[PDB]
Amino acid sequence: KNEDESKYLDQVRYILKNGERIDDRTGTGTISVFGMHSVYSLRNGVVPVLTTKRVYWKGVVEELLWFIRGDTNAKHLSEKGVRIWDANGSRQFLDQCGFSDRSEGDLGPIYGFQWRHCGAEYRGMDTDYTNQGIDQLSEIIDLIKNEPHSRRIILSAWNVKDLKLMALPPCHTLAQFAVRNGELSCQLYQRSGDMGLGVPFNLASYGLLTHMIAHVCGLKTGHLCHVLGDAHVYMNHVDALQEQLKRQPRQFPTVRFIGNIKTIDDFTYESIVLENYQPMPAIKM
Ligand SMILES: O=c1ccn([C@H]2C[C@H](O)[C@@H](COP(=O)(O)O)O2)c(=O)[nH]1
Numbered sequence: 001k002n003e004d005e006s007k008y009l010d011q012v013r014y015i016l017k018n019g020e021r022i023d024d025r026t027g028t029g030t031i032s033v034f035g036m037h038s039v040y041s042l043r044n045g046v047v048p049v050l051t052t053k054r055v056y057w058k059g060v061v062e063e064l065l066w067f068i069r070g071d072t073n074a075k076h077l078s079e080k081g082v083r084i085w086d087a088n089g090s091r092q093f094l095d096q097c098g099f100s101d102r103s104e105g106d107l108g109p110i111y112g113f114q115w116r117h118c119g120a121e122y123r124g125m126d127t128d129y130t131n132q133g134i135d136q137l138s139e140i141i142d143l144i145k146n147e148p149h150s151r152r153i154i155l156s157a158w159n160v161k162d163l164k165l166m167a168l169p170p171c172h173t174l175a176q177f178a179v180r181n182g183e184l185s186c187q188l189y190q191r192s193g194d195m196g197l198g199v200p201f202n203l204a205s206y207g208l209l210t211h212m213i214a215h216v217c218g219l220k221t222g223h224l225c226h227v228l229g230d231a232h233v234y235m236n237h238v239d240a241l242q243e244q245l246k247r248q249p250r251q252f253p254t255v256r257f258i259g260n261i262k263t264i265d266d267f268t269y270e271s272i273v274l275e276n277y278q279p280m281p282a283i284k285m
Pocket residue numbers: 024025168169171172192193194197198199202
C-alpha cells in the first residue's frame with residue numbers, strides 16, 4: 001500500500017547500485033546521484049514520515065516552530081532538547097568559520113531569518129528584527145489565500161548576499177507552493193540530501209509545513225514533489241541503509257491540529273497531533 005516510501009527505498013537502491021563514489025568537501029566518501037525526483041501524497045492528513053526507520057519527529061516539529069519564529073539561536077532549540085544545530089553554533093565551529101565576534105548558539109541569517117526577515121541586515125541572534133526585511137512566509141500565505149493560482153509562490157533560504165554569514169548554506173534551498181482542486185501542493189528543491197539522516201527529516205519537515213499552511217488557509221493538501229541535486233549515501237552508512245532496504249514500509253502517519261490555530265505563528269508543539277506513527281527502530285549510522 002505505502003508505494004510512496006517504496007519509492008524512497010528504490011532511490012536508495014538506485015544510488016547504491018549506480019551512484020558515483022566521490023569524496024565530499026570534508027574528504028568523506030559518498031555514493032552520489034545528481035538529479036533525483038519523487039512525489040509523496042499529502043492527501044487525507046498524510047505526512048511522509050518514513051516507517052522503515054524512526055524519524056526524529058520531536059526534532060522536526062521544534063525545528064519548524066523555531067524557523068517560523070525567525071529564530072537563529074541554536075540554544076533556543078537545544079533548550080527543548082533538540083541538539084541538531086548545536087555543533088554549528090559551538091564556540092569551536094564559530095571560530096573555525098571566522099565568526100569569532102558571535103555569541104555561542106548564533107547560526108547567522110539561516111532559514112528562520114530568511115523566512116521572516118529576508119534582506120534585513122543581520123546583526124546577531126539577540127537583535128530584535130520585528131518588521132525588518134521581507135516576511136516571505138506571510139507573503140506566500142497571502143498569495144495562497146488571495147491568488148491561489150499564482151506561479152510566483154516561493155519560499156527561499158538561498159540568499160546569495162547572506163551565504164557567507166550562515167553556519168551552513170541551506171540544503172533545503174527553496175520550496176514552491178501551488179493550489180489545485182482546493183489542494184495545496186509543495187515542490188521542495190533540495191541541493192544536497194544524505195539519504196540516511198537528512199532526507200527523511202527534511203521530507204517530514206516540508207510535509208508538516210505544507211499541512212500547517214493548508215490548515216491556516218482553509219485548504220486540503222495535495223502532494224509534495226521532492227527534487228534532489230546531490231542525492232548521496234555516506235560510505236559509513238551503506239550497511240545501515242542495506243539493513244533498511246530489507247524492511248517493508250508501513251502506512252504513513254497522519255497529522256491533525258488542535259486549538260484555535262488562525263495564523264502560522266499560533267502553532268505550538270501541543271497543537272500538532274501525529275497519528276499512527278509506529279516505525280521500525282532507528283538505525284545506527
Ligand atoms: O537539512 C539538511 C541539512 C544537511 N543535510 C546534509 C546534506 C549533506 O550531506 C550535508 C551538508 O553538506 P553540503 O551539501 O553543504 O556540503 O548535510 C541534509 O541532507 N539536510
